[PDB]
Write a protein that binds this ligand. Structure first.
Ligand SMILES: CCCCCCCCCCCCCC(=O)O[C@@H](COC(=O)CCCCCCCCCC)COP(=O)(O)OCCN
Ligand SMILES: CCCCCCCCCCCCCC(=O)O[C@@H](COC(=O)CCCCCCCCCC)COP(=O)(O)OCCN
Ligand SMILES: CCCCCCCCCCCCCC(=O)O[C@@H](COC(=O)CCCCCCCCCC)COP(=O)(O)OCCN
Ligand SMILES: CCCCCCCCCCCCCC(=O)O[C@@H](COC(=O)CCCCCCCCCC)COP(=O)(O)OCCN
Ligand SMILES: CCCCCCCCCCCCCC(=O)O[C@@H](COC(=O)CCCCCCCCCC)COP(=O)(O)OCCN
Ligand SMILES: CCCCCCCCCCCCCC(=O)O[C@@H](COC(=O)CCCCCCCCCC)COP(=O)(O)OCCN
Ligand SMILES: CCCCCCCCCCCCCC(=O)O[C@@H](COC(=O)CCCCCCCCCC)COP(=O)(O)OCCN
Ligand SMILES: CCCCCCCCCCCCCC(=O)O[C@@H](COC(=O)CCCCCCCCCC)COP(=O)(O)OCCN
Ligand SMILES: CCCCCCCCCCCCCC(=O)O[C@@H](COC(=O)CCCCCCCCCC)COP(=O)(O)OCCN
Ligand SMILES: CCCCCCCCCCCCCC(=O)O[C@@H](COC(=O)CCCCCCCCCC)COP(=O)(O)OCCN
Ligand SMILES: CCCCCCCCCCCCCC(=O)O[C@@H](COC(=O)CCCCCCCCCC)COP(=O)(O)OCCN
Ligand SMILES: CCCCCCCCCCCCCC(=O)O[C@@H](COC(=O)CCCCCCCCCC)COP(=O)(O)OCCN
Ligand SMILES: CCCCCCCCCCCCCC(=O)O[C@@H](COC(=O)CCCCCCCCCC)COP(=O)(O)OCCN
Ligand SMILES: CCCCCCCCCCCCCC(=O)O[C@@H](COC(=O)CCCCCCCCCC)COP(=O)(O)OCCN
Ligand SMILES: CCCCCCCCCCCCCC(=O)O[C@@H](COC(=O)CCCCCCCCCC)COP(=O)(O)OCCN
Ligand SMILES: CCCCCCCCCCCCCC(=O)O[C@@H](COC(=O)CCCCCCCCCC)COP(=O)(O)OCCN
Lengths: 69, 69, 69, 69, 69, 69, 69, 69, 69, 69, 69, 69, 69, 69, 69, 69, 69, 69, 69, 69
C-alpha cells in the first residue's frame, strides 16, 4: 500500500544518524590520523573534518533552528 | 544476501585498527627517524607524527566522546 | 537523534582541557628540558613554551574576558 | 507556509554568534596555545587569530558601519 | 493582469539590497573571521571579501556611472 | 579497538621518564665533560645543562604545580 | 592471488630495518663526520642525528609501547 | 556456448594480479625513483604509491574482509 | 598478431633500466653538482637524489620483496 | 627518422660536461671570489662550491660506481 | 636488471671511505693549518676537526656498536 | 538603495583610524615591551614597530602627498 | 539607445582613478602599517605596495608611453 | 546589399585596436596595480600582463611576419 | 548579539595591563636575577629589561602622546 | 585511386619528425629560456621539457622496442 | 595559397631570436637589478636569469646538438 | 593599426632607464641609509644594493656583451 | 586622470628628505646616545650611524654621480 | 640566429675578469681600508679579502688545474 515520504525520509535520517554515522565519524578520525602520519600536520585539516562531523551530527538541530521551527 | 553497512564499516575499522595500524605506525616512526638522519631535527615533525598516531589509535574513544555517546 | 553542537564542542573542550592537557603540558616541559640538554639554554624557548601552556589552560577565562562576557 | 529569508538569515547569525561562537573562540585560543607549545612563538600567529576572533564577534557592528547604516 | 518587468526586476533589486543584504554581509564577515581563526591570516582574503561587499552595495551607483547614466 | 589518548600519552611520558631519561642525562653529563676538556670551563654551560636535566625530571611536578592541580 | 597487507607492510619494515638500515646509519655517521670536518662542531647536529638513528632502530619497540601493546 | 561471468571476472582478476601486476608495480617504483631524481623528495609521494601497490595486491583479502566473507 | 602485455611491460622495464637509466642517473648527478655550484650545499638535496637513484635501480628487488615474491 | 634516447641523453651529457662545464666552473670560482671580497670568508662556502664542482665533473664515475657497473 | 640497494649503499660507503676520504681528511688538515696561519690558534678548532675525521673513519664500527650488532 | 563606495571606503578608513587604531597601537607597544622582557633588546624591533605605527596613522597625509593631491 | 564602449570604459577608468583610488591607496598604506606593527619590517613589503600604488596611478601615462602613443 | 567580410573583419580589428584597446590596456595596468597593492608583488604577473598588452598591440605585425607576408 | 571591537580590544588591554602584567614583570625581574647569578652581570641586560617593563606599563600614555591625542 | 594508410601515416610521421620537429624543439627551448627569465628557475621545468623532446624524437625506437618488434 | 609550416615556424624563431629577444634580455637584466635594489642579493637569482638568457639565445645550437643533428 | 613589439619593448626600456630609474636608485640609496641608521652597518647590504643599481643601469651594455652582439 | 611616476617618486623622495628625514636623523642620534649611556662606547656604532645619516642625505648627489649623470 | 653558449659564457667571463674586476678589487681594498680605519685591525679580514681577490683573478687557472685540464 506504500508509505508516505514523511516516514521514509525520516527512516533515511534515522539510519544515517544512528549506528552508521558513528562508525563513519570513526573512519573520518582514522583518516585525519593517517593524513597526519605521512605528511604535514595542519590545523586546517582537523578543523575542517571536526566541523564536518559536527555538522553531520548537528543536522537535526541545525535544521530546526535555521528554519525558525 | 548482502550485509548491513553497520557490520561492513565496523569490519573496515577493525581491519584498519588491528594488526595493520601497528605496522603503519611503525612505518611512521621509521619515517621520522629517517627524516632526522638526513636533515634537521625539529620538535614539530615528531610532535605532528606522534599526534597523528595518537589520533589514529584514539579514533574510537575520540568518536565516542565527541558525539556525547 | 543527534546532539546540538553546543554540547559537542563543549565535550571537545572538556576533553582537551581535562586529563589530556595535563600530560600534553608534561610532554612540553620534557621537550624544553631535552632542548636545553643538547644545545643552548635561551630564555626565549622557556618563555614561549610556558606562555603556550598558560594560553592553553587559560583559554576558558581568556575567551570569557576577550568577548566581554 | 515558509518564512521570509530576513528571519532565517538572522537566525543563522544569532546561532553562529550566540553560545556557539564562544566555544569556537575558545577552541581557537586552545589552538594557538598548542601551536606555541610545540614550535616557535611568533606574534604573527596570535595577532592573526585574535584579529579573526574580533572580526567574528564584531561582524554586526562592522556590517552596520561599513554600509553607512 | 501581470506587471511590467521594469517593476519586477526593481523589486528583486530592492529585496536583495534591503534588509537581506545586510545579514548576508554579516555572514560574510563571520566567514572571514572563522577563516582567520582556524588557519592563516592573509590580507588577500579580507581584501577580496570587503571588495565583494562594496561591489554588492555599490551595484546601484556602479551601474549608474558605468553606463554614462 | 584502539586506546584512549589519556593512556597513550601517559605511556609516552613513562617511557621518556623511565630508564631512557636516565641514560639521556648520563649522555648530557658526558657532553658537558667533553666540552670542558677541549675548550674553556664556564659556569653557564653546566648551569644550563643541569637546569635542563632538572626540568626534564621535574616535568611531572612542574606540570602539577603550574596548573594549580 | 595477492597477499594480505599485514604481510606486505611487515616485509617493508623488515627490509627497511634489516641490512639496509645499517648502511643507512653508516651513511648518516659519515655525513656528520664530513659536516664536522668542513665547518663547526656543534653538539646539536650529533645529538639530532644519533637521535634519528635511535628512533629508526627503536621504531618497533617505540610502536609497541606507545600503543599500549 | 559461452562461459558464466563468475569465471570471466575471475580470469580478469587472475591476469591483473598475476605476472602483470608485478611489472606494473615495478614501473610504479621506477616512476617514484624518477620523480625523486628530478625534483623534490617528499614522503607523501612514496607513501601514496606504496599504499596504491598494497591496495592493488591486497584487493583479494581486502574484499574478503570488507564484505564479512 | 600482437604480443601479451607480460612481455611489453617487461620490455619497458628493461629499456628504462638498461643503458638509458645510467645516463639518466648521470644527469641527476650533474644536476646536484650544478645546484651545489650556484647556491647552498645541503645534505637534503644529495640525500633525496641519491635515494631517488637507488629506488630507480632497486625497483626490481624492491618489487620482489614488497610483494612477498 | 628520429634517434634513440640512448644517444640523445649521451649528447646532453657530453655537451654539459665538455667545454661548457669548464666555463661554468670558472664562473663558480669567480662567484666564490666575489663572495669573499664583499663579506666574510668562511670555509663552508668554498667547501660546498668545490664539492659541487667535483660532483659535476665526477658524475660519470660516480654513476658508474654507485650502480655497481 | 637493476641491483638491490644493499649493494648500492655499500658501494657508496666503500667509495666515500676508500681513497676519497683519505684526500678529504688531508684537505681538512690543510684547512686547519691555513686557519691557524692567518688568525688565532684555538684548541677548539683542531679538536672539532680531528673529531670529525675520527667520526668519518669510525662510521663503520660506530654503526656496528651503536646498533648492538 | 545602496551607498556609493566613496562613502563606504571612507567609513572603513574612519573606523580603522578612529578609536580602534589607538588601542591597536597600544597593543603593538605592549607587544614590543613583552618582546624586550623575555629576550634581547634590539633597536631594530622598536624602530620597525614605531615606523609601522607612524605609517598607520600617517596613511591619510602619506596618500595625499604621494599622489600629488 | 546605448553608448559606445569608448565612453563606458573611460567612465570605468575615471571612477577607478578618481576619489575611489585615493581611499584605496589609503587602505593599502594602513595595511602596510598594520603588517609592520604585528610582525617584521621588511623593505620588500613597502617597496611592493608603493610600486603597486604608483602603477595604479600611473596607468594612464604608462599606457600612453608603452604603446608609442 | 551587404559588405564583403574582408571589410567587416578589418572594421572589427580597427575598432578593437583603436581607442578601445588603449583604455583596455589602461584597465589592465590598473588591475596589476591593484593586485600589487593587496597581496604580493611578483615579476610573473607584470611580465604576463605586459606581454599580453604587447601581443594585443603587436597583433598586426605579428600576423604579417608569422605568415611570411 | 556581539560587541563592538572598541570594547573587546579595551578588555584585552585592561587584562594585559591589570594584575597579569604585574606578575609578568615580577617574572622578568626573577629572570634577570637568575641571569646575573649564573654568568656575568652586564648593565645592558638590566637596562633592556627595565626598559621593556617601562614600555609595557607606559603603553597607554606612550600611545596617547605619540599620536598627538 | 587512393593510397593505403600504411603510407599516409608514415608520411605524417616523416613530416612531424623531419624539419618541422627540429624547429618545434627549438621553440620549446626558447620557451623554457623565457620561462626562466621572468620567474623562477626550477629543474622540474627543464627536465620535463627535455624529456618531452626526447620522447618526440625517440618515438620511432620507443615504438619499435615497446612492441617487441 | 598558404605557406608550409617549415617556413612559418622558422619565421617565428627568427622573430623571437632577432631584435626582440635582445630587448627581452635587457628587460630581464633590468628586472634582476631592481630585485637586487629592494631586497636581498642572492647568487641564485642572477644565476637562474643568466641561465635563462643563455638558454634562450642558445636554443638553436642546443636543439642542433641535443638531437644529434 | 598597432605597433611592432620591437618599438614597444624599446619604449619600456627607455622609460624604465630614463628619469624613472634615477629616482628609483635615489630611493634605493635612501633605503640603505635608513637601514644603516636603525641597526648595524654591514658591507654586504651596500655592496648588494650598489651592485643592483649598477646592473640596472648597465643592462643595455650587459645585454650587448653577454649575447656577443 | 592619474600622474606620471616621474612625479610620484619625486614626491616620495622630497617627503623622505624634507622635514621628516631631519627628525629621523635626530632620532638616530638619540639612539646612539642612549646606546652609549647603558653599555660600552665603541667608535663602530657612531661611525656606522653617522655614515647612514650621510648616505641618507647624500642620496641625491650619490645617485647623480654614481650614474655618470 | 643566436650564438652557442660556449661563446656567451666566455664573454661573461671576459667581462667579469677584464677592466671590471680591476675596479671591483680596488673597491674591495678601499673597503678593507675603511674597515681598519673605524674599528680594529685584524689579520683575518685582510687575509680573507686578499684571498677572495686571488680566487677571483685565479679562477681561470684554478679551473684549468682542478679539472685535470
Ligand atoms: C588584533 C589584536 C592583536 C593582539 C595581540 C596581542 C599579543 C601580545 C602578546 C605578545 C607576544 C609576543 C610574541 C613573542 O615575541 O614571543 C615572546 C612571548 O613570550 C611571552 O611573553 C609569553 C607570554 C604572553 C602571554 C600573553 C597572552 C596573550 C593572550 C591574548 C588573547 C617570547 O619571545 P620569543 O623569545 O619571541 O623569541 C622568538 C623570536 N621570534
Ligand atoms: C577594498 C577594501 C580593502 C580593505 C582592506 C583593509 C584591511 C586592513 C587589515 C590589515 C590586515 C593585514 C593582514 C596581515 O598581514 O596579518 C596581520 C593582521 O593582524 C592584525 O593586525 C589583525 C587585526 C586587524 C583587524 C582589522 C579589521 C578589518 C575589518 C575590515 C572590515 C598579522 O600579521 P601576520 O603576522 O601577517 O603574518 C602572516 C604573513 N602572511
Ligand atoms: C572589459 C572591462 C574590464 C574591467 C576590469 C577592471 C577590474 C579591476 C579590478 C581589479 C581586481 C583585481 C582582482 C584581484 O586580484 O583580487 C584583488 C582585489 O582586491 C581588491 O582590491 C578589491 C577592490 C576592487 C574594487 C574595484 C571595483 C571594480 C568595479 C568595476 C565595475 C585582491 O587580491 P586577491 O588577494 O587577488 O588574491 C587572490 C589571487 N587570485
Ligand atoms: C602529542 C604528543 C607529542 C609528543 C612529543 C614528545 C617529543 C619529545 C622529544 C624532544 C625532541 C626535541 C627536538 C629538538 O629540539 O632537537 C633536539 C633533540 O635531540 C635529542 O635529544 C634526540 C633524542 C630524543 C629521543 C626521544 C624519542 C621520542 C620518541 C617519541 C615516540 C636536539 O636539539 P637540536 O639541537 O634541536 O637544535 C636544532 C634547533 N631546531
Ligand atoms: C564510507 C567508507 C569510507 C572509508 C574510507 C577509509 C579510508 C582511510 C584511508 C586514509 C587515506 C588518506 C588519503 C591521504 O591523504 O593520502 C595519504 C595516504 O597514505 C597512506 O597512508 C596509504 C596507506 C593507506 C592504506 C589503507 C587501506 C584502506 C583500504 C580500505 C578498504 C598520504 O598522504 P598524501 O601525502 O595525502 O598527500 C597528498 C595530499 N592530497
Ligand atoms: C603505506 C606504506 C607507507 C610506506 C612509507 C615508508 C617510506 C619511508 C621512507 C622515508 C622517506 C622520508 C622522506 C624525506 O623526508 O626525505 C628524506 C629521504 O632521504 C632518504 O633517506 C632517502 C633514502 C630512503 C630509501 C628508502 C626506500 C623506501 C622504499 C619503500 C618501498 C630526505 O630528507 P629531505 O631532506 O626530506 O628534506 C626535504 C623536506 N621535504
Ligand atoms: C640514501 C643515500 C644517502 C647518501 C648521502 C651521502 C652524502 C654524504 C655527503 C655529506 C655532505 C654533507 C653536506 C654538508 O653539510 O655540506 C658540507 C659538504 O662539504 C663537502 O664536504 C663536499 C664534499 C662531499 C663530496 C661527497 C660526494 C658524495 C657523492 C654521493 C653519490 C659543507 O658544509 P656546509 O659548510 O654544510 O655548511 C652549510 C650548512 N648547511
Ligand atoms: C640522543 C643521543 C645523544 C648522544 C650525544 C652524545 C654526543 C657526545 C659528544 C660530545 C660532543 C660535544 C660537542 C662540542 O662541544 O665540541 C667539542 C667536541 O670535541 C670533541 O671532543 C670531539 C670528539 C668527540 C667524539 C665522540 C664520538 C661520538 C659518536 C656518537 C655516536 C669541541 O669543542 P668546540 O671547541 O665545542 O667549541 C665550539 C663551541 N660550539
Ligand atoms: C618603488 C618605490 C619604492 C619606495 C620604497 C621607499 C621605502 C624606504 C623606507 C626604508 C625602510 C627600510 C626597511 C628596514 O630595513 O627596516 C628599518 C626601517 O625602520 C625605519 O626606519 C622605519 C621608518 C621608515 C618610515 C618611512 C616611511 C615610508 C613611506 C613611503 C610611502 C628598520 O630596520 P630593521 O631593523 O630592518 O631590521 C630588520 C632586518 N630585516
Ligand atoms: C614582456 C615584457 C616584460 C616587462 C617586465 C618588466 C618589469 C620590470 C619590473 C621589475 C619588478 C620586479 C618584481 C619584484 O621582484 O618585486 C620588487 C619590485 O619592487 C619595485 O621595485 C616596484 C617598482 C617597479 C615599478 C616599475 C614599473 C613597471 C611598469 C611596466 C609597464 C620588490 O621586491 P619583492 O621584495 O620582490 O620581494 C618579494 C619576492 N617575490
Ligand atoms: C607550434 C608553435 C608554438 C609557438 C610557441 C612559442 C611561444 C613562446 C613564448 C613563451 C611564453 C611562456 C609562457 C610563460 O611561462 O609565461 C611567461 C611569459 O612572459 C613573457 O615573457 C611574455 C613575453 C612573451 C612574448 C612573446 C610573443 C610570442 C608571439 C608568438 C606569435 C611569464 O611567466 P609566468 O610568470 O609564466 O608564470 C606563470 C606560471 N604559469
Ligand atoms: C621611525 C621611528 C624610530 C624611533 C626609534 C627610537 C627608539 C630610541 C630608543 C633607543 C633604544 C636603543 C636600543 C638598545 O641599544 O638597547 C639599549 C636600550 O636600553 C634602554 O635605554 C631602554 C630605555 C629606552 C626607553 C625609550 C622608550 C622608547 C619608546 C618609543 C615610542 C640597552 O643596551 P643593550 O645593552 O643595547 O645592548 C644589547 C646590544 N644589542
Ligand atoms: C602501464 C604502463 C605505465 C608506464 C609508465 C612509465 C613511465 C615512467 C616515466 C616517469 C615519469 C614521471 C613524470 C614526472 O613526474 O615528471 C618528471 C619526469 O621527468 C623526466 O625524468 C623525463 C624523462 C623520462 C623519460 C622516460 C621515457 C618513458 C617512455 C615510456 C614508453 C619530472 O618531474 P616534474 O618535475 O614532475 O614535476 C612536476 C610535478 N607534476
Ligand atoms: C630527461 C633529461 C633531463 C635533463 C635535465 C638536465 C638539466 C641540468 C641543468 C641543472 C639545472 C638545475 C636547476 C637549478 O637548481 O637552478 C640552478 C641553475 O642555475 C644554473 O646553473 C643555470 C645554468 C644551467 C644551463 C644548463 C643548460 C641545460 C640545457 C639542457 C638542454 C640555480 O640555482 P637556483 O639558485 O636553483 O635556486 C632556486 C631553488 N629552486
Ligand atoms: C649560468 C651563468 C651563471 C653566471 C653567474 C655569475 C654571477 C657572478 C656574480 C657574483 C654575485 C655573488 C652574489 C653575492 O653573494 O652577493 C654579493 C654580490 O655583491 C657584489 O659584488 C655585486 C657586484 C657584482 C656585479 C657582477 C655583474 C654580473 C652580471 C652578469 C651578467 C654581496 O655579498 P652579500 O653580502 O652576498 O651577502 C648576502 C648573503 N646572501
Ligand atoms: C671537497 C673539497 C673541499 C676543498 C676545501 C679546501 C679549501 C681550503 C682553504 C682554507 C680556507 C679556510 C677559510 C678560513 O678560515 O679563512 C681564512 C682563509 O684565509 C686564507 O688563507 C685565504 C687564502 C686561501 C686560498 C686557497 C685557495 C683555495 C682554492 C680551492 C679551489 C682566513 O681566516 P678568517 O680569519 O677565517 O677568520 C674568520 C673566521 N670565520
Amino acid at each position: 500500500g506504500g508509505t508516505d515520504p514523511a516516514t521514509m525520509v525520516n527512516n533515511i535520517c534515522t539510519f544515517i544518524l544512528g549506528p552508521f554515522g558513528q562508525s563513519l565519524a570513526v573512519l573520518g578520525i582514522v583518516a585525519i590520523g593517517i593524513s597526519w602520519m605521512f605528511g604535514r600536520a595542519s590545523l586546517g585539516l582537523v578543523a575542517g573534518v571536526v566541523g564536518g562531523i559536527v555538522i553531520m551530527f548537528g543536522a537535526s538541530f541545525l535544521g530546526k533552528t535555521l528554519t525558525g521551527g
